[PDB]
Design a protein around this ligand. Structure first.
Ligand SMILES: CCCCCCCCCCCCCCCCCC(=O)OC[C@H](COP(=O)([O-])OCC[N+](C)(C)C)OC(=O)CCCCCCCCCCCCCCCCC
Ligand SMILES: CCCCCCCCCCCCCCCCCC(=O)OC[C@H](COP(=O)([O-])OCC[N+](C)(C)C)OC(=O)CCCCCCCCCCCCCCCCC
Ligand SMILES: CCCCCCCCCCCCCCCCCC(=O)OC[C@H](COP(=O)([O-])OCC[N+](C)(C)C)OC(=O)CCCCCCCCCCCCCCCCC
Ligand SMILES: CCCCCCCCCCCCCCCCCC(=O)OC[C@H](COP(=O)(O)OCCN)OC(=O)CCCCCCCCCCCCCCCCC
Ligand SMILES: CCCCCCCCCCCCCCCCCC(=O)OC[C@H](COP(=O)(O)OCCN)OC(=O)CCCCCCCCCCCCCCCCC
Ligand SMILES: CCCCCCCCCCCCCCCCCC(=O)OC[C@H](COP(=O)(O)OCCN)OC(=O)CCCCCCCCCCCCCCCCC
Ligand SMILES: CCCCCCCCCCCCCCCCCC(=O)OC[C@H](COP(=O)(O)OCCN)OC(=O)CCCCCCCCCCCCCCCCC
Ligand SMILES: CCCCCCCCCCCCCCCCCC(=O)OC[C@H](COP(=O)(O)OCCN)OC(=O)CCCCCCCCCCCCCCCCC
Ligand SMILES: CCCCCCCCCCC1=C(C)C(=O)C(OC)=C(OC)C1=O
Ligand code: SF4
Lengths: 110, 105, 98, 42, 312, 80, 156, 70, 169
């Protein structure tokens, strides 16, 4: 309840500041501006490499999502199994990184 | 095809997450542990065809523990009759159902 | 049953019919598909937290991860479509009628 | 059995490979001083 | 009374962000054998006030926006996420004491790239969109080592509770068992906030915003800078906490966080920029393999030493 | 095995430190004498209630009071 | 009156904030760019006056035309000038920006930048020194200090 | 010289000292001159709500000791 | 009103899906799914699933919808009746459901649903010094061995498959 009040207060302060930034200098009666970029009007060329680094982020972030219960998982009684599976998850993240390396996936954004 | 590799090789690949009555971490019971244990111990070994008619009481108990539909229907009836008697002025709530009695412990 | 399950199931069916009635884009289709996955996450989570079935609390995370990986696959499929026609329009995917 | 609807269908190519059916030009102008016309391939 | 506490959080954040700009211009001045601002105020203290009044009465730049709604929402989201990263911060008591404050901060910092992305698409410039995609890919790249380094350090904490992280460091600073994680953390948080030598937004996305909303993006970015320095201070340089005198902890973490923010200011006046592929090479081929190796080491290390921290 | 190791430490020291730290993380819990104490501390942390047993008549090793001598002891945890 | 006092104090406030936070966009055309780079150097240090070093042309407050304006770049100068938000000011630095200078009778030189943009401060020299350019910037600040935007708005 | 940057650092340091000092004094004022009760776990919440019921003033922080038993 | 808050969040949740199931544009669709993920996270938080809700933020929103908006911003070059009609259709269906289940305390679209607030179905005990949800997620490494093997293998194969099908060779 305190957190919802805090979030609402921060959103209200941000919206108030954004409204003051978008409406206080509108009251200036300066002048109408007649006829208000490196590429002129060409279409945006699709970069395969930006999409590749985004999907590599998504997959390694999923592996991070598997790694996130480890400070709680160190408290278990089956520690040999836990340690094996934790090292196996970080090892499979490293194998994902090594395969991303050696098949030229980390290139021109290395 | 149900190639029961787990029972053949003696490994436990996915039986632990199967039911709520299984071995939980730190011995946490589910909210319907007793009902599911009774339904499983009723319906064990006798087959599904016999189990649908010979364990109907345990399964209705366990389903009504899970979803609480009869419980919520009874609470709906009690609360709606209470609201009708409040609207008609035939009833008043007690002081201990208003917040003026300094709860027990 | 409980009243929040009504809204989570109806959200799943809304995103179903959005995923079952395309307009033009494949990206809007994948958005409806991941809305379906999100509603499944919420519904499985509310069941498992309701019944206090402890071991299934790792279940929706798995339901996230696989399906999020699934989304990655679909995005790459979309990109290959957008590396042929310039758009992700589903009406350009009709070369297999004959 | 070609009908009126399935009459504009030609058979698919023999190797089943279809024909696929430009690089970016930037103007880093004056905005010492220098104008540049870049032909970039990514 | 809680609303007074929220105000005494969020208004001094804005004031410290306002005077961080003066401290940046002064510290970059003296490191460049010149002075910073010393004319507008006594010792320059009225320079941010003059500059804020200047920006709020400057003409609106009036762009042709692609989407009006996301053009409005990107400063709103940037400021809201810049302010909500402070509420679990234990100093020595947070505003919102929660069990998962670390994961909350990692989540609300993961949400910060939508402001960059919406501001880039809401501008009609394709060049601004390319710059926004580069900045988003950079930030989501370094969030990977943020998450993994942060997990590896919290394997010594026992929980995601930020208040437990002070109890963790009552005998030693946590930089002594984890200085390689500390230095990769420090460079990764330097790369989170688009901060030099990782500022490719200044090297040749929100250039279509007027002076007001661009100032709001700027102050959200400096709130993130102060916040990540405070979070690094709590995370690796945990101060002494006497519960009967909390101001000892407050003075101590304030001095350490000021030194760490000055260290950001001191890095930006020392190095040239990376090329974009060079910091991609820095993440994926230098920081992430060592981060995974140290994650294995900090998984296996409390087990081999019998130093597993408590769950509670 | 000797020139190759110095070569990869000269060219790519980040990767050598990576595989060295990961190799120590793999092998060293199997060689550490303190790995057993992690197990013994985690199983000695009482999250639940020690639900007592009905004294049927023959349980010589189960105590009747917590301060009785018989039962599990944690003097190894205090001393170490 | 009372409202005249209010518009006087608000003019003093907004003129203080506008002269104490000048953000320049410097056209580095020619040799005068070197002397602007000395006006940013540690001896003279524009940054201690609130005058930042190299603001972007869409958030800058004053355009310093520092060098020779040719015919090939005069539409680019006018484009950058039109893209500045108001209040925008123009400092003309050096003889070629002022009146053509040593290239006044040339076929390819705009005879002063004031044929292209409205100029506020003409800073004379070849090049004017960094101290003389800083003199021109402080004279621009004094010109902003006596602006009467709200007093004339109140009297209209 | 280099001590000219110190007024701005002092202003910024006071502005960072305000939130923690303020939340510490507010947590002492709103909780009877003590720390705020950390209830991260449901046992801690159970004890805190038991305190709220055993105080009689609907407040968890008003403590009752041996004077409340006979 | 406050005892129905999860229900109210769930209504916003359904509204959020009509924010993108009508499919206005994939960027407005992305924004609608972000707001939907936030409110559904709040629903998860209000049964006590804090870690699962922060997975909805960190992995679903901050991880994956980032990539959706990223890939979408690399398409649909920057500048309906059916959209607004389908939107108000789904909205009126949902508010008719609200009105029915609030005037009857019972509804049946496909299943029977109660009309009281969903606070009633909760448990009246404590979990001690652990979250049962946190310990069930910590159980992934001790009890969940086969699940970790197949999930890590599927993610490794996912990396391999993404690199194969995007190479074009
Ligand atoms: C590749 C496989 C790497 C992991 C190998 C197993 C590691 C381990 O400790 O497993 C024990 C674990 C768990 O055993 P445990 O020792 O924890 O059992 C104690 C009982 N519980 C779990 C209730 C505490 O798994 C198994 O025993 C069976 C599942 C894995 C079996 C091997 C699968 C290989 C598949 C190849 C294709
Ligand atoms: C909190 C952080 C800082 C917030 C912002 C700074 C605080 C002060 C805010 C108010 C400052 C004064 C108003 C804005 C500046 C106006 C300057 C200007 O261009 O004036 C000429 C303008 C227009 O004057 P004009 O009619 O002569 O137009 C000039 C343009 N021509 C001639 C080409 C058409 O004046 C106004 O717009 C007056 C608005 C009201 C002024 C204040 C009234 C009293 C308020 C108390
Ligand atoms: C929290 C407080 C602050 C923390 C410290 C940080 C303050 C200092 C900041 C200085 C300014 C930095 C500006 C940005 C610089 C960015 C560039 C950069 O540094 O790139 C990193 C560089 C990048 O490499 P590079 O580019 O320099 O080298 C060339 C690399 N190749 C060949 C691939 C092209 O180095 C790293 O990535 C190192 C990261 C940290 C390493 C930690 C190792 C710890 C030791 C482990 C054990 C080793 C022994 C072996 C095993 C023994 C077992 C017993
Ligand atoms: C019958 C089963 C569905 C019941 C709900 C129907 C909701 C109202 C929509 C009816 C169809 C309207 C329509 O024209 O749909 C076509 C449109 C895609 O066609 P398009 O080419 O984009 O537009 C030109 C129109 N031919 O298709 C769409 O845009 C469909 C979008 C569907 C999203 C459903 C939203 C929730 C609806 C209520 C809950 C179910
Ligand atoms: C948590 C703490 C945060 C602190 C933040 C702020 C830090 C700096 C605080 C201010 C330090 C001193 C500032 C002095 C500014 C210069 C004032 C001055 O001399 O103005 C002179 C001017 C003209 O006066 P005139 O009468 O013409 O003089 C001729 C004399 N024969 O007359 C005028 O200009 C009119 C008078 C203007 C007065 C303005 C004063 C500054 C206001 C700044 C805002 C913050 C206030 C302090 C907040 C914290 C303390 C409560
Ligand atoms: C485009 C739209 C506008 C964009 C700008 C604004 C939105 C984006 C920025 C704001 C993001 C809000 C995030 C809200 C939830 C954050 C997660 C959270 O609440 O975690 C903290 C805490 C978990 O810690 P714990 O200690 O376990 O809980 C106390 C019990 N021991 O959990 C709690 O303490 C739980 C408290 C009760 C439940 C709170 C529910 C809050 C309301 C729902 C979500 C609000 C945001 C919806 C939109 C998000 C869009 C991204
Ligand atoms: C068994 C332990 C656990 C192992 C798995 C966990 C690893 C944790 C760290 C994660 C690593 C992920 C990334 C791995 C990628 C490996 C492939 C690679 O990088 O090959 C290329 C590299 C030469 O670099 P190049 O291609 O030229 O780069 C261009 C810039 N010059 O080639 C090289 O630099 C050669 C790399 C191979 C040889 C490294 C030898 C290190 C030995 C350290 C001491 C012994 C440690 C014990 C373990 C040994 C395992 C082999
Ligand atoms: C009803 C009547 C009143 C109407 C409303 C007005 C309320 C009060 C507003 C503030 C004061 C207005 C007067 C402004 C200054 C006027 C006098 C002046 O210009 O003094 C000049 C003096 C410095 O002299 P200078 O010309 O710079 O010399 C160069 C060095 N030899 O300058 C100085 O010494 C410094 C001047 C500082 C100006 C005041 C401080 C800044 C404004 C603070 C309040 C507004 C902003 C609040 C916070 C915003 C967000 C941070
Ligand atoms: C009302 C609260 C403050 C609103 C924000 C305005 C003041 C802070 C930002 C201004 C600013 C300063 C001081 C500044 O120094 C600067 O240059 C580095 C900027 O541009 C990149 C700025 O935007
Ligand atoms: S006025 Fe003279 S010194 Fe100055 S830029 Fe022109 S040619 Fe060079």
């Amino acid at each position: 309840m305190n957190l919802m009040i805090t979030l609402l207060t921060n959103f209200t302060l941000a919206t108030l500041l954004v409204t003051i930034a978008f409406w206080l200098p509108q009251l200036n009666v300066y002048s109408e501006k007649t006829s208000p970029d490196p590429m002129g009007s060409a279409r945006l060329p699709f970069s395969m490499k930006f999409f590749l680094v985004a999907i590599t982020f998504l997959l390694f972030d999923l592996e991070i999502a598997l790694l996130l219960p480890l400070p709680w998982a160190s408290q278990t009684t089956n520690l040999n199994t836990m340690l094996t599976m934790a090292l196996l998850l970080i090892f499979l993240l490293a194998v994902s990184l090594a395969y991303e390396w050696t098949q030229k996936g980390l290139e021109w954004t290395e | 095809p149900f190639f029961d590799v787990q029972k053949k090789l003696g490994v436990d690949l996915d039986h632990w997450m199967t039911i709520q009555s299984a071995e939980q971490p730190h011995r946490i019971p589910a909210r319907c542990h007793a009902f599911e244990k009774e339904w499983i111990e009723c319906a064990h070994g006798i087959g599904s065809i016999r189990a649908e008619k010979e364990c109907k009481i345990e399964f209705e108990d366990f389903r009504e523990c899970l979803l609480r539909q009869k419980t919520m229907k009874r609470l709906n009836a009690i609360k709606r009759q209470r609201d009708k008697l409040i609207k008609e002025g035939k009833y008043t709530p007690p002081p201990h159902h208003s917040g003026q009695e300094d709860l027990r412990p | 049953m409980s009243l929040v399950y009504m809204n989570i199931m109806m959200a799943f069916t809304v995103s179903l019919t959005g995923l079952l009635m395309y307009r033009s884009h494949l990206m809007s289709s994948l958005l409806c598909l991941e809305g379906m996955m999100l509603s499944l996450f919420i519904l499985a989570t509310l069941m498992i937290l309701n019944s206090h079935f402890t071991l299934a609390s790792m279940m929706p995370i798995i339901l996230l991860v696989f399906a999020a990986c699934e989304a990655a696959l679909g995005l790459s499929l979309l990109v290959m479509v957008s590396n042929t026609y310039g758009t992700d329009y589903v009406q350009n995917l009709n070369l297999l009628q004959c | 059995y070609p009908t009126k609807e399935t009459a504009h269908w030609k058979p698919p190519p023999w190797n089943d490979v279809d024909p696929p059916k430009s690089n970016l030009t930037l103007n880093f102008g004056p905005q010492g001083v220098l104008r540049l016309v870049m032909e970039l391939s990514g | 009374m809680f609303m007074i506490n929220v105000l005494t959080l969020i208004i001094p954040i804005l004031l410290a962000v306002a005077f961080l700009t003066l401290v940046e211009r002064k510290v970059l001045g003296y490191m460049q054998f010149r002075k910073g601002p010393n004319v507008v105020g006594p010792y320059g203290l009225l320079q941010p006030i003059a500059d804020a009044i200047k920006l709020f009465i400057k003409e609106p730049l009036r762009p042709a926006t692609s989407s009006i709604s996301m053009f409005i929402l990107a400063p709103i989201l940037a400021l809201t996420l810049a302010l909500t990263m402070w509420i679990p911060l234990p100093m020595p008591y947070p505003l919102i004491n929660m069990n998962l404050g670390v994961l909350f901060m990692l989540a609300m910092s993961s949400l910060a790239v939508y402001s960059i992305l919406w501001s880039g698409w809401a501008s009609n410039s394709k060049y601004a969109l390319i710059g926004a995609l580069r900045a988003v890919a950079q930030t989501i790249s370094y969030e990977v080592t943020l998450a993994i380094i942060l997990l590896s350090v919290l394997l010594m904490n026992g929980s995601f509770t930020l208040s437990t992280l002070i109890i963790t460091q009552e005998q030693v600073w946590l930089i002594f068992p984890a200085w390689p994680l500390a230095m990769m953390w420090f460079i990764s948080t330097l790369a989170e906030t688009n901060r030099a030598p990782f500022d490719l937004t200044e090297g040749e996305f929100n250039v279509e915003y007027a002076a007001g909303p661009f100032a709001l993006f700027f102050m959200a970015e400096y709130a993130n800078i102060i916040m990540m320095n405070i979070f690094t201070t709590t995370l690796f340089l945990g101060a002494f906490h006497n519960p009967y005198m909390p101001e000892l902890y407050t003075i101590n973490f304030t001095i350490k966080s000021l030194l760490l923010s000055i260290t950001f200011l001191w890095i930006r006046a020392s190095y040239p920029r990376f090329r974009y592929d060079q910091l991609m090479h820095l993440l994926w081929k230098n920081f992430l393999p060592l981060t995974l190796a140290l994650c294995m080491w900090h998984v296996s290390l409390p087990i081999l030493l019998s130093s597993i921290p408590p769950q509670t | 095995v000797a020139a190759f190791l110095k070569n990869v430490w000269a060219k790519e020291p980040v990767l050598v430190a990576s595989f060295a730290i990961a190799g120590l993380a793999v092998i060293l819990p199997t060689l550490s004498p303190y790995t057993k104490y992690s197990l013994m501390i985690n199983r000695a942390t009482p999250y639940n209630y020690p639900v007592p047993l009905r004294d049927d008549g023959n349980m010589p090793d189960v105590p009747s009071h917590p301060q009785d001598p018989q039962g599990p002891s944690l003097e190894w945890l205090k001393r170490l | 009156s009372r409202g005249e006092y209010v518009v006087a104090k608000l003019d003093d406030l907004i003129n203080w904030a506008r002269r104490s936070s000048l953000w320049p966009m410097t056209f580095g055309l020619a040799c005068c760019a070197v002397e602007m780079m000395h006006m940013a150097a540690p001896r003279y240090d524009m940054d201690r006056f609130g005058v930042v070093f190299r603001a972007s042309p869409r958030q800058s407050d004053v355009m310093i035309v520092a060098g020779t304006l040719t015919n090939k770049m005069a539409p680019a100068l006018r484009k950058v000038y039109d893209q500045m938000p108001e209040p925008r000011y123009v400092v003309s630095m050096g003889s070629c920006a002022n009146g053509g200078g040593y290239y006044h009778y040339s076929y390819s030189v705009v005879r002063g930048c004031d044929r292209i943009v409205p100029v506020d401060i003409y800073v004379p020299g070849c090049p004017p020194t960094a101290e003389a350019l800083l003199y021109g910037i402080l004279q621009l600040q004094k010109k902003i200090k006596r602006e009467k935007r709200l007093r004339i708005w109140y009297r209209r | 010289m280099w001590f000219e940057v110190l007024p701005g650092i002092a202003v910024m340091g006071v502005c960072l000292f305000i939130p923690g000092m303020a939340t510490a004094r507010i947590h002492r004022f709103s909780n009877g001159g003590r720390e705020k009760r950390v209830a991260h776990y449901s046992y801690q919440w159970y004890l805190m709500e038991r305190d709220r019921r055993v105080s009689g003033v609907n407040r968890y922080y008003v403590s009752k000791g041996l004077e409340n038993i006979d | 009103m406050m005892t129905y808050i999860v229900f109210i969040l769930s209504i916003i949740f359904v509204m959020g899906f009509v924010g993108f199931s009508s499919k206005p544009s994939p960027i407005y669709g992305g924004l609608g799914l972000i707001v939907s993920g936030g409110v559904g996270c709040g629903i998860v938080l209000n049964f006590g699933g804090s870690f699962l809700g922060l997975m909805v933020f960190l992995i679903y929103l901050g991880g994956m919808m980032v990539v959706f908006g990223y890939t979408t911003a690399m398409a649909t070059e920057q500048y309906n009746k059916v959209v607004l009609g389908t939107f108000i259709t789904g909205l009126l269906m949902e508010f008719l459901m609200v009105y029915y289940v609030l005037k009857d305390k019972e509804v049946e679209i496909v299943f029977k649903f109660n009309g009281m607030g969903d606070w009633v179905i909760y448990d009246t005990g404590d979990s001690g010094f652990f979250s049962e949800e946190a310990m069930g997620i910590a159980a992934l490494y001790s009890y969940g061995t086969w699940l970790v093997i197949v999930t890590g293998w599927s993610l490794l194969i996912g990396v391999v498959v993404i690199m194969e099908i995007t190479r074009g060779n």
